[PDB]
Design a protein around this ligand. Structure first.
Ligand code: OLC
Ligand code: OLC
Ligand code: OLC
Ligand code: OLC
Ligand code: OLC
Ligand code: RET
Length: 231
């Protein structure tokens, strides 16, 4: 018996990420269109990275104890190593779908790195009140990203192939609804106010992670928008 009550959700998350990796890897076999190859490679790497980090949490490697509030608090730091590499890849899927300009992609990836990097600092900070200063900076970086996705990409997708505009609009709406939930769980969870216990928080993140990575990929890779217009 594992002593951590949240282990059942880490085990399920590891299995779904693994099955998602294998499904995408087999579906991509034989795809020869170079454009589709780009989206298969980016989208298959997302669950493959998350699989190794969920496994590290399940085995206890990606966990550490952070003193704050007079209590040793168990912080899963492996979540941020996961998100550092998977969240910019998800943004690249959207940016390449709309043929975004290079300067915009750099702005998105750079703000994404600030978002995850300050969230890591906030999770490891020992002065309790300062943890919410880093939460606020990270959340401001996210709001810059959400703005670009609505008032920068949407304007350009509408001037492209109808299948690209329709698929982008769906993946854009999914992204904004799912990404906006992460700061709320972090704030009321063990990393912040501590109102939700760690076992329920782990359940919430696992549902969000699978929907935002596997659910996101199932919508993208079944669409014709990833293929170049050909006869
Ligand atoms: C798509 C099909 C799948 C649908 C799945 C979506 C569900 C997402 C998970 C939700 C939160 C549930 C958390 C369980 C509630 C536990 C809270 C509780 O009862 O705590 C009691 C405490 O002892 C006294 O307050
Ligand atoms: C039980 C199963 C557990 C889950 C599996 C273990 C994951 C770790 C292993 C391998 C990395 C394999 C390669 C990952 C890179 C995939 C990129 C890709 O396939 O892109 C296709 C593109 O079209 C090509 O040009
Ligand atoms: C397109 C870009 C593709 C990017 C592909 C990158 C995927 C790498 C994945 C995983 C291993 C992560 C391991 C992180 C190493 C942490 C080890 C550490 O520093 O631990 C310190 C201390 O010993 C204990 O707390
Ligand atoms: C956590 C930090 C590490 C991970 C961060 C991920 C950043 C990935 C790199 C670059 C974006 C630079 C612009 C790349 C966009 C090029 C798309 C394009 O416009 O087409 C040109 C392309 O060469 C086809 O011809
Ligand atoms: C645009 C989409 C993304 C937006 C993301 C930003 C949303 C920030 C929301 C709320 C602050 C609410 C804070 C409430 C925390 C109070 C906890 C507390 O101290 O109360 C203890 C508890 O009530 C005793 O049981
Ligand atoms: C792999 C799945 C997704 C959708 C991951 C998204 C992560 C975030 C939106 C993280 C947000 C954070 C902020 C803005 C503030 C608290 C710390 C976080 C890093 C969790």
């Amino acid at each position: 018996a594992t002593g951590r009550p949240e282990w059942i959700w880490l085990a399920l998350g590891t299995a779904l990420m693994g099955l998602g990796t294998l499904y995408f890897l087999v579906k991509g076999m034989g795809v020869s269109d170079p454009d589709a190859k780009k989206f298969y490679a980016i989208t298959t790497l997302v669950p493959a990275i998350a699989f190794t980090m969920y496994l590290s949490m399940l085995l206890g490697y990606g966990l550490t104890m952070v003193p704050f509030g007079g209590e040793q608090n168990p912080i899963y730091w492996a979540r941020y190593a996961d998100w550092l590499f998977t969240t910019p890849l998800l943004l690249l899927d959207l940016a390449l779908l709309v043929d975004a300009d290079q300067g915009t992609i750099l702005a998105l990836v750079g703000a994404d790195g600030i978002m995850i990097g300050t969230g890591l600092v906030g999770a490891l900070t020992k002065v309790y009140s300062y943890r919410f200063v880093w939460w606020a900076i990270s959340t401001a970086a996210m709001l810059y990203i959400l703005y670009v996705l609505f008032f920068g990409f949407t304007s350009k997708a509408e001037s492209m192939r109808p299948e690209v505009a329709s698929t982008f609009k769906v993946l854009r709406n999914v992204t904004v609804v799912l990404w906006s939930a992460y700061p709320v769980v972090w704030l009321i969870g063990s990393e912040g106010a501590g109102i939700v216990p760690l076992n329920i928080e782990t359940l919430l993140f696992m549902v969000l992670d699978v929907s935002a990575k596997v659910g996101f990929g199932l919508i993208l890779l079944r669409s014709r928008a990833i293929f170049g217009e050909a006869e």
